[PDB]
């Protein structure tokens, strides 16, 4: 399925994603996917976009991902949407 190795991937977020990350404390320009996933996860919970569907129709997350919603259990799909907003190091 999804390898644990993916969490070690080094990435450089594009401007829009970087802006979202910085709203939950992100201080850097290069991150590990583990960091990106956590910061996104915290952005999601603190904004009560989730409580298995995440609703992001009127949130920058929705513009970032290109969807009005998505399931938190569909990890492969989530990884794809995230990569649309970053560059691998
Ligand atoms: C929506 C809450 C959030 C969440 C909240 C707080 C901390 C974390 C840390 C795991 C990063 N995640 N979260 C979860 O709570 C999980 C358990 C949902 C699940 O499968 O039941 C896992 C989920 C995840 C983890 C790793 C890779 C992918 Cl693609 C998805 C993860 C998540 C979901 C969506 C995004 Cl965009 C980013 C991270």
Curated annotation (Swiss-Prot):
It is found in: Nucleus, Nucleoplasm; Cytoplasm; Nucleus, Nucleolus; Nucleus. Phosphorylated at multiple sites near the RING domain by ATM upon DNA damage; this promotes its ubiquitination and degradation, preventing p53/TP53 degradation. Autoubiquitination leads to proteasomal degradation; resulting in p53/TP53 activation it may be regulated by SFN. Also ubiquitinated by TRIM13. ATM-phosphorylated MDM2 is ubiquitinated by the SCF(FBXO31) complex in response to genotoxic stress, promoting its degradation and p53/TP53-mediated DNA damage response. Deubiquitinated by USP2 leads to its accumulation and increases deubiquitination and degradation of p53/TP53. Deubiquitinated by USP7 leading to its stabilization. Residues 1-80 are annotated as: Sufficient to promote the mitochondrial pathway of apoptosis. Ubiquitous. Isoform Mdm2-A, isoform Mdm2-B, isoform Mdm2-C, isoform Mdm2-D, isoform Mdm2-E, isoform Mdm2-F and isoform Mdm2-G are observed in a range of cancers but absent in normal tissues. Residues 1-89 are annotated as: Necessary for interaction with USP2. Residues 9-88 form the SWIB/MDM2 domain. Induction: By DNA damage. It comes from the Eukaryota. MDM2 RING finger mutations that failed to ubiquitinate p53 in vitro did not target p53 for degradation when expressed in cells. Region I is sufficient for binding p53 and inhibiting its G1 arrest and apoptosis functions. It also binds p73 and E2F1. Region II contains most of a central acidic region required for interaction with ribosomal protein L5 and a putative C4-type zinc finger. The RING finger domain which coordinates two molecules of zinc interacts specifically with RNA whether or not zinc is present and mediates the heterooligomerization with MDM4. It is also essential for its ubiquitin ligase E3 activity toward p53 and itself. It is linked to Seems to be amplified in certain tumors (including soft tissue sarcomas, osteosarcomas and gliomas). A higher frequency of splice variants lacking p53 binding domain sequences was found in late-stage and high-grade ovarian and bladder carcinomas. Four of the splice variants show loss of p53 binding. Belongs to the MDM2/MDM4 family. Interacts with p53/TP53, TP73/p73, RBL5 and RP11. Binds specifically to RNA. Can interact with RB1, E1A-associated protein EP300 and the E2F1 transcription factor. Forms a ternary complex with p53/TP53 and WWOX. Interacts with CDKN2AIP, RFWD3, USP7, PYHIN1, and RBBP6. Interacts with ARRB1 and ARRB2. Interacts with PSMA3. Found in a trimeric complex with MDM2, MDM4 and USP2. Interacts with USP2 (via N-terminus and C-terminus). Interacts with MDM4. Part of a complex with MDM2, DAXX, RASSF1 and USP7. Part of a complex with DAXX, MDM2 and USP7. Interacts directly with DAXX and USP7. (Microbial infection) Interacts with herpes virus 8 protein v-IRF4. E3 ubiquitin-protein ligase that mediates ubiquitination of p53/TP53, leading to its degradation by the proteasome. Inhibits p53/TP53- and p73/TP73-mediated cell cycle arrest and apoptosis by binding its transcriptional activation domain. Also acts as a ubiquitin ligase E3 toward itself and ARRB1. Permits the nuclear export of p53/TP53. Promotes proteasome-dependent ubiquitin-independent degradation of retinoblastoma RB1 protein. Inhibits DAXX-mediated apoptosis by inducing its ubiquitination and degradation. Component of the TRIM28/KAP1-MDM2-p53/TP53 complex involved in stabilizing p53/TP53. This is E3 ubiquitin-protein ligase Mdm2. The gene is MDM2.
